[PDB]
Ligand binder design. Structure first.
Ligand code: F6C
Ligand code: CLA
Ligand code: CLA
Ligand code: CLA
Ligand code: CLA
Ligand code: CLA
Ligand code: CLA
Ligand code: CLA
Ligand SMILES: CCCCCCCCCCCCCCCC(=O)OC[C@H](COP(=O)(O)OC[C@@H](O)CO)OC(=O)CCCCCCCCCCCCCCC
Ligand SMILES: CC1=C(/C=C/C(C)=C/C=C/C(C)=C/C=C/C=C(C)/C=C/C=C(C)/C=C/C2=C(C)CCCC2(C)C)C(C)(C)CCC1
Ligand code: SF4
Ligand code: SF4
Ligand SMILES: [Ca+2]
Lengths: 170, 75, 42, 31, 80, 742
């Protein structure tokens, strides 16, 4: 009687009510889609290396901080920044080893699940193993670089502080 | 310490009546009015249930308004 | 006396980060977003 | 007396309501 | 593209057609004036908007009007 | 085809860089937008108004927040004559320590900006005493801006978009704006003035914690209900009352003293509360004139359509006006450009009134002694008013282009002024020519007399009519015993009534030769008033000519078919440059800027000579033009241009930099204003050749580089001329006053 006869804010996913999802404002509004679809994972046209490079830069940058503030070396500035840098380095190398072995194990013949050729998953667009290896290399490069950029900004915090206060104009 | 509160004088009966008439003015816009029971609509539109409800809300509004005006000097 | 920028006001660390964000960190992303908005095709 | 840090952070958090209301009105007026 | 409109005060003097640098205008038979001709503007996608046709018109007011409209790469006169 | 702009398919097909520039300057012209109905137009304008009010509230909230966080409001209320109010803090990382020291005052620990907007005086006159009060007001305005934003978003929803008949309701809106936007709001402001502003002026603190406790008067709403209203005007503030303190205080809340508080040199707060009450009552009355849906009331349309003909039931003060005002109601109500150009003229007259009244009758405590604030506020509102008056005639022209119906307005007043428009334009031309020839020739004669060593041979004409109007108000400065100057005159005594209880207070102020209320005027004032007359007349000539010739002239009969803004009609018929009606608002912006320059130059020099004590500098130096050049521009520049020199920097360094910045922008304007399009298009063609033939230059323009169009560059050069003209004079007026009178 009322089952999809009135027009509500929550629609079937892709107009298909037998799919296992709903079109809610968090996965289907113009603001949510404009943000998510333009994130490097989903931005149209990008090569996998550039996607991974930007993901890594953003990720290695913030991963330095938790150990700088909370780590065992936090009582001293230099050691805290070094502990944060090597924590970001280790998490990056572990995550990229995982990306590489995911691609190695998944793409064997026709893969199973979302990377099978018949899959309709819109949220997982890296369908080839070449995409995954280019992504792994890019995430590694970008994340190690973003980690050492955050490390270099934290090491020179005394200089960056005197600069942003105009103390260098004497 | 306590919110003043006056006794009862012609000034208190005026506020309690002007607030009972505002209740009548706004209680004409209710639904299911003149609901028989007793005197089905023999109170200028309202029945006896609607008159009692309007005057009960008017007494409530009157007690609130009178104690507020007595607290702040006006009454 | 004043060898550097100071704030004698509450949360005086906020100009230190707000002026970079508003003026030379977030503007080129905003310019890129607006450029991609005005150059997108039908 | 002068404002506190919490009074500045209250301002910063409370201006997120006109900040996202303005974005909602801007996208409702359809560029 | 610009809009070039020709009105019935035309006298078929051909001067608008001769003055057009981009060949927008031509003469068509009319029997509405004694020259037997009236201007027409079919290739108005070529119109740049120089209004040489309007300068060449002798009638008061002009029997040909150019209304500058949507700019294309042809009406902007761009060789790049 | 791009997707931008979404409001114009013709600009999406545009393959050049013109569509980006034309999508920015046609974005708010909703009428000429793709698939725009009248109803959708009104609804979009409604939501845009709401977003605009949100911006205004956010701006005021930010001003309040920065005075409460980075100003010295609590430190300034202790001594509002020897402490400079602070706007906000500087966080320029590029300063040297010499500029950090220069912008740091004695009582501050960081570089700051000195506030010249007058908000300290205004907030101090209305009760605000602490930074917590300012922060509470700022947070209220932040939330109120959020409310306006939500209202604007809400009325774009389909169940909430108003109908077109709602927007056309010109009887309900006038009733609710007169009584409820002007009346109830002014009644609430009187309520604040007697509950917060006057008590805090006497020393008692009233807040949102004890205002229900504290009564505004010792007999709380006893005199009002009983009918004895004269009790509220008893025991006012004495002459030796010190503001914000109870020494000399009174108890009256509504009194009509007149003149000024002798210690703040400002209007009395009892007078302003009584004013806003007598305004609120009259406006609440006036918002009961037109009928909405209760039978009683007038109809505006029936009142206007009844002014057709002769007789006492008809339009009798001009019986030869044909159809009179028939169709004038529909011309007003249907055309949004008629309304906007009408309301802009009303607002531009009110803004000039604001400027002309707030220096002569200062309403805020100790703002007459903040000289730079007074000058900045007057110049600010007079330039805003000149722009509003320019846009009034702009939209009067746009109405005659877009919305004017010659058959609905057949032979009425509007179509009757369009008929004889050459008489109006030629008589504005005659007044302009007469004023210009005579004023310039009088000034040049005075120049040649003073240069040849004869200041005594100058033609010095006294403004005897304005000196007499100064006398009819009670000025004894001259030998004219006129109306209120004559103490036992019919006007002074109010013979049957004797109820002008404003007369002694007002004559204590007009005769006081230290305020700005009716300043003394002499021969140098007459000439500059005639220059102001010339300026307003020529600006009106340009705007009236372009509005009345908007629909067509003899050089271009069908000008209404080409729009409001269009470049030209080619080089035929001798040439038709600047022929559109938009080009008249273009050409009159220069004349508005020049006229307001003359106005503000006059005001500033008059007041600088008064404030310095050397009033004879303006008196015997403003009758010839080298005195204006040398004793005003050259002389009051020495502190500004020394804001930074090879020896150091003071706090006038930014005003020197902005002075030069405005000179630069004004000069850049002349590039767009003198050089025209084809030069730059050929230059850009050579640049396109150079770019396609250079190695390693992998970028390529997605949209073809073209020179700015004719109307576009007219607008760009005019915007530059305006911005540089405002920046130069704003930097000079703040620094020539803030240095002489810190
Ligand atoms: C990218 C793209 C591109 C490229 C590539 O790629 C280019 C290049 C060229 C070459 C070839 C040459 C040489 C170089 C030089 O020396 O000089 C410099 C300049 C510049 C500008 C430089 C440039 C560079 C680039 C831009 C880089 C980039 C940067 C970043 C990216 C930014 C950032 C972004 C964000 C987002 C903001 C040129 C030039 C010229 N331009 Mg030209 N470009 C271009 C762009 C542009 C634009 C937009 C405009 C407008 C403004 C123009 C303009 C111009 C003019 C006027 C001229 C001239 O004068 C010149 C010539 O001709 O010679 C002869 N043009 N170039
Ligand atoms: C020369 C005429 C003139 C003068 C003396 C002022 C003076 C003032 N304006 Mg301004 N204003 C003007 C013309 C003028 N205005 C015009 C024509 C416009 C319409 C665009 C504005 C729009 C405007 C806004 C939106 C605001 C002011 C504000 C102010 C006040 C604070 C700024 C200050 O202390 O001094 C400095 C005065 C200068 C002119 C310095 C030069 C800066 C250049 C002009 C920047 C170019 C931008 C543009 C052309 C106009 C900006 C003016 C304003 C930001 C200073 C001050 C009383 C502020 C206020 O209301 O305080 C609460 C404020 O928010 N005005
Ligand atoms: C006539 C107008 C009027 C005025 C001046 C007041 C004033 C006041 N009311 Mg009141 N009130 C009113 C009408 C009014 N009321 C009406 C019509 C009702 C509905 C019955 C109420 C019900 C009400 C309650 C339940 C309470 C108040 C309370 C208060 C006091 C607290 C102040 C505050 O927080 O706000 C204050 C003096 C509070 C109080 O402090 O009690 C002493 C409180 O408990 N009011
Ligand atoms: C429109 C009013 C207004 C204006 C002109 C300013 C101006 C300024 N602010 Mg301020 N701000 C405002 C409102 C305003 N503020 C409000 C309401 C708050 C409370 C949340 C703040 C909180 C704030 C902080 C914490 C700081 C500033 C700072 C500054 C200075 C540097 C710029 C900056 O970092 O921005 C920062 C802005 C924010 C953090 C929030 C801004 C929110 C406002 C309401 C946005 C207004 C948008 C406007 C209405 C839309 C106009 C449209 C467009 C055509 C311009 C600058 C003088 C810095 C400073 O003090 O320098 C020393 C500083 O770090 N502001
Ligand atoms: C009492 C009921 C009421 C009230 C308060 C309003 C109020 C308002 N309406 Mg509304 N309206 C109403 C009923 C009402 N309306 C009804 C019944 C209809 C149907 C017919 C409409 C249809 C309508 C439309 C179509 C529109 C409005 C609009 C507006 C706003 C325009 C004025 C403005 O921007 O603010 C400011 C004006 C003042 C504060 C008063 C101005 C008086 C002078 C000029 C200034 C005061 C002088 C004084 C010296 C100031 C000094 C202050 C200084 C010291 C700080 C305003 C907030 C416009 C809008 O949408 O905005 C969102 C608009 O487009 N109304
Ligand atoms: C409800 C609104 C209101 C209130 C409470 C007052 C109250 C007052 N008015 Mg008043 N007035 C009002 C509206 C109001 N006015 C309006 C709308 C006008 C315009 C016609 C006036 C024009 C007016 C004048 C000319 C005078 C007063 C005066 C007075 C004071 C004594 C008069 C009296 O006893 O009665 C008193 C405080 C008198 C006064 O202030 O004496 C010093 C006085 O001379 N009023
Ligand atoms: C209530 C005030 C008001 C409103 C709502 C309008 C509304 C409108 N006007 Mg307008 N007008 C006004 C007052 C107003 N006007 C005043 C006061 C003037 C005299 C200055 C004018 C003169 C005028 C003309 C000549 C025209 C309009 C037009 C228009 C329509 C489109 C505007 C547009 O293209 O979008 C948006 C435009 C812009 C966003 C341009 C912004 C750039 C401006 C010019 C300067 C910006 C300042 C600068 C950036 C400061 C930087 C300095 C510093 C950083 C260095 C629109 C309905 C046009 C029209 O109706 O077409 C037929 C039209 O041609 N008006
Ligand atoms: C100092 C510069 C200057 C001068 C003297 C003028 C003068 C004039 N303008 Mg002009 N204007 C100027 C700058 C100037 N403008 C600029 C920069 C613009 C922006 C483009 C304009 C735009 C403009 C427009 C759009 C209009 C004028 C008009 C006028 C004339 C009417 C005012 C008048 O009659 O006074 C009297 C005459 C004079 C002061 C001329 C000087 C007489 C000389 C000195 C005689 C002696 C000569 C002998 C050889 C010595 C007038 C000739 C209006 C007009 O034509 O009215 C009919 C007209 O509509 N002006
Ligand atoms: C002020 C503090 C710092 C400022 C940084 C942020 C500035 C604004 C950044 C723009 C991002 C918005 C992108 C919209 C992306 C989007 O949703 O697109 C919506 C709309 C067009 O979208 P479409 O209909 O094409 O959407 C289709 C696709 O999304 C999928 O179907 O674009 C616009 O409305 C442009 C008008 C925005 C005008 C913004 C100005 C309003 C000011 C807002 C203030 C923001 C404050 C936020 C923090 C409190
Ligand atoms: C959601 C969202 C959000 C959030 C955001 C976020 C989350 C953030 C962030 C952020 C981040 C996280 C950022 C970042 C970054 C980065 C960067 C900027 C980087 C870099 C780098 C570099 C530059 C490097 C370099 C190098 C290399 C590579 C090599 C060698 C070494 C070196 C160092 C040189 C919010 C709510 C707020 C709002 C909006 C939306
Ligand atoms: S405007 Fe120029 S190109 Fe167009 S029809 Fe006339 S003469 Fe030909
Ligand atoms: S120039 Fe004018 S009159 Fe002659 S043919 Fe062309 S349109 Fe007709
Ligand atoms: Ca440790």
């Amino acid at each position: 009687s009322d089952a999809y006869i009135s027009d509500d804010p929550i629609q079937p996913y892709q107009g298909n009510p037998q799919l296992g999802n709903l079109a809610t404002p968090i996965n289907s509004s113009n603001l949510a889609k404009a943000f998510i679809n333009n994130l490097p994972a989903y931005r149209p046209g990008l090569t996998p290396f550039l996607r991974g490079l930007e993901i890594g830069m953003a990720h290695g940058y913030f991963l330095v901080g938790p150990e700088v503030v909370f780590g065992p070396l936090k009582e001293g500035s230099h050691g805290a920044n070094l502990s944060g840098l090597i924590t970001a380095i280790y998490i990056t190398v572990s995550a990229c080893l995982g990306i590489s072995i995911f691609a190695l194990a998944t793409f064997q013949g026709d893969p199973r699940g979302t990377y099978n050729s018949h899959s309709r998953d819109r949220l997982r667009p890296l369908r080839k193993k070449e995409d995954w290896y280019q992504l792994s290399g890019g995430i590694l490069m970008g994340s190690l670089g973003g980690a050492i950029f955050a490390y270099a900004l934290l090491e020179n915090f005394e200089l960056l502080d005197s600069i942003l206060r105009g103390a260098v104009n004497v | 310490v306590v919110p003043n509160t006056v006794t009862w004088g012609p000034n208190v009966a005026i506020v309690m009546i002007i607030c009972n008439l505002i209740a009548f003015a706004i209680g004409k816009q209710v639904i299911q009015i003149p609901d028989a029971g007793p005197a089905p609509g023999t109170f200028l539109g309202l029945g006896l249930p609607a008159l009692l409800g309007v005057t009960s809300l008017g007494h409530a509004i009157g007690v609130g308004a009178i104690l507020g005006l007595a607290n702040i000097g006006v009454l | 006396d004043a060898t550097q920028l100071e704030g004698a006001y509450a949360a005086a660390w906020l100009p230190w980060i707000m002026i970079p964000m508003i003026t030379y960190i977030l503007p080129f992303p905003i310019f890129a977003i607006a450029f991609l908005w005005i150059e997108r095709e039908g | 007396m002068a404002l506190s840090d919490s009074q500045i952070f209250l301002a910063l958090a409370l201006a997120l309501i006109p900040g996202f209301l303005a974005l909602r009105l801007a996208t409702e007026l359809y560029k | 593209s610009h809009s070039v409109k020709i009105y019935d005060t035309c006298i078929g003097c051909t001067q608008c057609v001769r003055a057009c640098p981009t060949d927008v205008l031509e003469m068509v038979p009319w029997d509405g004036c004694r020259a037997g001709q009236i201007a027409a503007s079919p290739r108005t996608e070529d119109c740049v908007g120089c209004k040489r046709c309007e300068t060449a018109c002798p009638t008061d007011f002009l029997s040909i009007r150019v209304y500058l409209g949507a700019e294309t790469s042809r009406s902007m006169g761009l060789a790049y | 085809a791009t997707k931008f702009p979404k409001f114009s398919q013709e600009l999406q097909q545009d393959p050049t860089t013109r569509r980006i520039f034309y999508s920015l300057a046609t974005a708010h012209d909703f009428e000429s937008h793709d698939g725009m109905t009248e109803e959708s137009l009104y609804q979009r304008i409604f939501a845009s108004h709401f977003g605009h009010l949100a911006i205004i509230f956010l701006w005021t909230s930010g001003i309040l927040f920065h005075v409460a966080w980075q100003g010295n409001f609590e430190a300034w209320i202790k001594d509002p004559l020897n402490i400079s109010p602070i706007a906000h803090a500087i966080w320029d990382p590029q300063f040297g320590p010499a500029a950090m020291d220069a912008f740091t005052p004695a009582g501050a620990g960081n570089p700051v900006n000195f506030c010249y907007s007058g908000v300290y005086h205004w907030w101090y006159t209305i009760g605000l005493r602490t930074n917590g009060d300012l922060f509470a007001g700022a947070m209220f305005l932040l939330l109120l801006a959020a409310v306006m934003l939500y209202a604007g978003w809400l009325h774009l929803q389909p169940r909430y978009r108003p109908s077109l008949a709602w927007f056309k309701n010109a009887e309900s809106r006038l009733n609710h704006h007169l009584a409820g936007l002007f009346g109830v709001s002014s009644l609430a402001w009187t309520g604040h003035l007697v509950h917060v502003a006057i008590p805090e002026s006497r020393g008692q603190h009233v807040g949102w914690d004890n205002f229900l406790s504290m009564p505004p008067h010792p007999e709380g709403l006893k005199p009002f209900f009983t009918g004895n209203w004269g009790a509220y005007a008893l025991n006012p503030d004495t002459s030796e009352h010190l503001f914000n303190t109870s020494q000399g205080a009174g108890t009256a809340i509504l009194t009509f003293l007149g003149g000024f508080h002798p210690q703040t040199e400002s209007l009395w707060l009892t007078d302003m509360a009584h004013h806003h009450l007598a305004i609120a009552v009259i406006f609440i009355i006036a918002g009961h004139m037109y009928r909405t849906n209760f039978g009683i009331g007038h109809s505006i349309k029936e009142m206007t359509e009844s002014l057709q003909g002769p007789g006492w039931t008809g339009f009798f003060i001009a019986p030869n006006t044909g159809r009179g005002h028939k169709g004038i109601y529909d011309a007003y109500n249907n055309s949004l450009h008629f309304q906007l150009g009408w309301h802009l003229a009303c607002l531009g007259v009110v803004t000039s009134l604001v400027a002309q009244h707030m220096y002569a009758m200062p309403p805020y405590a100790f703002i007459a002694r903040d000289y730079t604030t007074t000058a900045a506020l007057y110049t600010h509102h007079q330039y805003i008013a000149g722009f509003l008056m320019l846009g009034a005639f702009a939209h009067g022209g746009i109405f005659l282009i877009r919305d004017y119906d010659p058959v609905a307005n057949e032979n009425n007043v509007l179509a009757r002024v369009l008929d004889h428009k050459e008489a109006i334009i030629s008589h504005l031309s005659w007044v302009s020519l007469f004023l210009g020839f005579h004023t310039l020739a009088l000034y040049v004669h005075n120049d040649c007399e003073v240069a040849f060593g004869s200041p005594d041979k100058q033609i010095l004409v006294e403004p005897v009519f304005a000196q007499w109007i100064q006398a009819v108000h009670g000025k004894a400065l001259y030998g004219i015993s006129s109306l209120l100057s004559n103490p036992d005159s019919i006007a002074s005594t109010a013979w049957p009534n004797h109820a002008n209880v404003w007369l002694p207070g007002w004559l204590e102020a007009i005769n006081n030769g230290t305020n700005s209320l009716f300043l003394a005027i002499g021969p140098g004032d007459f000439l500059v008033h005639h220059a102001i007359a010339l300026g307003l007349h020529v600006t009106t000539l340009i705007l009236v000519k372009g509005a009345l010739d908007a629909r067509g002239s003899k050089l271009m009969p069908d000008k209404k078919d080409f729009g409001y803004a269009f470049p030209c009609d080619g080089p035929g018929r001798g040439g038709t440059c600047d022929i559109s009606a938009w080009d008249s608002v273009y050409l009159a912006t220069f004349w508005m800027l020049n006229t307001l320059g003359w106005v503000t130059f006059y005001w500033h020099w008059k007041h600088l000579a008064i404030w310095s004590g050397n009033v004879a500098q303006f008196n015997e130096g403003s009758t010839y033009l080298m005195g204006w050049f040398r004793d005003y521009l050259w002389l009051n520049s020495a502190q500004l241009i020394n804001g930074y020199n090879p020896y150091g920097t003071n706090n006038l360094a930014i005003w020197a930099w902005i002075f030069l910045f405005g000179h630069l922008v004004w000069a850049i304007s002349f590039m767009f204003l003198i050089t025209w399009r084809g030069y730059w298009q050929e230059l850009i063609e050579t640049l396109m050749w150079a770019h396609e033939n250079t190695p390693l230059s992998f970028g390529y323009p997605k949209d073809k580089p073209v020179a700015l169009s004719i109307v576009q560059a007219r607008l760009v050069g005019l915007v530059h001329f305006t911005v540089g003209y405002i920046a130069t004079y704003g930097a000079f007026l703040i620094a020539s006053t803030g240095s002489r009178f810190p």
